[PDB]
Amino acid sequence: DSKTFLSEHSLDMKFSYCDERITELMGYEPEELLGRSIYEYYHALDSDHLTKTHHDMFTKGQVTTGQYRMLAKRGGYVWVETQATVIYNTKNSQPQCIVCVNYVVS
């Protein structure tokens, strides 16, 4: 509820949409994040296992990241867990975008 924000990403994980609830949780305005890779915000120590998770994402269709730190606009990092779901084009069944349910645990 109060700890959650939705996002949408292109297949390279750049933000194509972000829930306004993120502002209260991490300080960013959604417009700030549009077009930027979420990898720019992951803590360096979490990048590798998140890359592995997103690799499996296209094979599995839906994945959960487990816990990672994400850089907030101010105040340092927040702990997050994300469930990512691939949305497919009907005609060619090719991946279209990624929808993420992000929840803060710190």
Add this chain to the structure above:
Amino acid sequence: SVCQPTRFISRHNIEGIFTFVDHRCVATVGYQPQELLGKNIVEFCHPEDQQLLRDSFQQVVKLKGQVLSVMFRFRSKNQEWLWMRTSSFTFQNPYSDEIEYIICTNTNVKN
């Protein structure tokens, strides 16, 4: 260089009521978010498709988190009945037992 399909995300309770609407709904179906919130998506659905849409709510709940897609006609603000493909799945925060809700990605597609 890439023409992207027009789409928006919404959240619904199991009954079909909009409980969240992403602002791209304006471009997609013509309505402001406040004009959809609190209303059942079935209200905007073509009569031929309404039961198919109702059934989709029930089915997506039984998929327990997996994605279901359905095609239906949605009455836009300007009264054009747009072909929409909605891919939906339920979510429940793993740390609690709040009732599942449905996340929908709604795209205006050719049919």
